[PDB]
Symmetry: C6
Subunit: 95 residues, 6 copies
């Protein structure tokens, strides 16, 4: 199935590293970037579930190594419900 | 009825929303950000469906790595004045 | 006199419950919703002063019972000065 | 002159503004949000009126349930360069 | 040389006093006002370096005397690189 | 390559940016605000230039009165997908 994978960091450089490592690690596309305040930012990828699993693992490993990198929360959703797309910005850049 | 789950953190709120819409016959109608990392998702449906959905959404958001549920509430017959002031029904048509 | 009543909560679900309970408790209209950050949100009602007093009391009681509900500050202003309307968003939805 | 009261919390800032405009001959000209729950209201008038207004506004905002006054200041003859950079005079016409 | 001078405060009244005292103290113009959250606000002046030094010293002294005034950070840059102007809002009101 | 310095505080981020562009052949291409007083500046250039620039920017931002460097990172060959999702290259033409 298609899945989305999410890494939320405290800090911008770490979220950029999470995104870069995710898209380089597996066949996924970066589709979202969400800011919710308090320094919390999330990047969202989409692809086949196994690919998303590989990408999220790579992104966590990489973001942890950033100078001042802080990973706050991570999650994968297989088969996200279609209602989510038009309410939550998880798929903003998916076409 | 309207059901609301507020989390600290975005991944947890997404999981709350996904689990809510998959658990019962409810529509996700709102997403509100108020700072301090606090985000709320809002669903609408028959009260029994909303009750089922919110329970499922809490259970799922609690299991998210770094998931933090902050507040949850169900309102059965929300007053019509709320619709056009508060973004609880943004995507209800 | 006409008054405005305000309940500020930390958290969105509690502010929605405050608003709902306020408009159901008395002859008031919900006229404002203000976000100032740090999780602080305020709802504002308008009506005859005695009605606003009843509504604010009901809203506090209800918002306190919300799971994770936190009431931060509450206040009633009788006869708000007309200068306030066009500077502060207390009466946004009053027509 | 310009007089400013900054509070933590919205209800308290509204009460500061109301009490200021009712206490003396000043006009409420600004409302500024800067995060951390900090909000400022700004009035303009003759300096003696502004002084009276700010004193009344502090006394009233202190009495608000959960009211928190954070900072207050009066500037008598603010430099004209400030007008078009800082939102101290947004509603002054 | 032309320089920019910056005073960042926690709180709005103190930043207004910093700006006023800066423009009154020396031959500088107020050219920027930046908000970055958490109550942190910065005002930016421009002028000859010696004038900017005098202005920043005056602004610090004044902002420290504000009731609830908190100066967080201050800095002067002589000859700011031209790349900065169109990325960072340090010179928004310089014409 | 892309180089990033994130500070707590605006004056420090400006000094990081100025020192970076003056230290080597890099262009300042981004400025991102994410709350909690955290701001990041982003430069682009050949990796060796970026390395020189980030080192200079850290050293300078550390010396700012009330300067606080929070996080720094260099990415050598950022993936093209990042460009149109993240504001790392806003001013790169």
């Amino acid at each position: 199935s298609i899945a989305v994978g999410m890494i939320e960091t405290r800090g911008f450089p770490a979220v950029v590293e999470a995104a870069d490592s995710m898209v380089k690690a597996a066949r996924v596309t970066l589709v979202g970037y969400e800011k919710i305040g308090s320094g919390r930012v999330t990047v969202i990828v989409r692809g086949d579930v196994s690919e998303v699993q590989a990408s999220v693992s790579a992104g966590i490993e990489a973001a942890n190594r950033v100078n001042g990198g802080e990973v706050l929360s991570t999650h994968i959703i297989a088969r996200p419900h279609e209602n989510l797309e038009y309410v939550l910005p998880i798929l903003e850049h998916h076409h």
